[PDB]
Amino acid sequence: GELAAIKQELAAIKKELAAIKYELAAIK
Amino acid sequence: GELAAIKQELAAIKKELAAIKYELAAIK
Amino acid sequence: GELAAIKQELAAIKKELAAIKYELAAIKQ
């Protein structure tokens, strides 16, 4: 599961970047 | 080695995502 | 290969985080 874990962590990071970019957008 | 290093890269990124989400939240 | 793909995904993420930190900095001013 070492490679599996890494791919799931990378997947998760895209949802966190999305969350953040929407909050930045709102401020502008 | 090169494979191992990916876990430290991920660690770094998760810490900075946390920081950023908290900083944005705090502002709003 | 698997390493190649992952290095590009990490690059991509650091570029987006960089952009965000600069944009956040600008806002706090």
10 Å CB burial of residue A23 (0-12, 13-18, 19+) is: middle
Q: How far is CA C25 from CA A1, A2, A6, B7, B28, in A?
A: 38, 36, 30, 28, 14
Q: Which two structure tokens, joined as six digits, stand for C24?
A: 């956040």
Reported structure resolution in angstroms: 1.7
CA distance C2 to chain B (A): 10
Sign for the pseudo-dihedral over CA of B2, C9, B24, A28: positive
- SS3 breakdown of chain B: % helix, strand, coil, rounded to 5? 95, 0, 5
Q: Name the residue range of residue A13's domain.
A: 1-28
Structure-determination approach: X-ray
For B10, the closest of A9, A16, A23 (CB atoms) is: A9
**Alpha helices (runs of H) in chain C, residue ranges in sequence order:** 2-28
The residue assigned the tokens 């494979």 is: B3
Dmax (CA) of chain B: 42
Domain count across chain A: 1
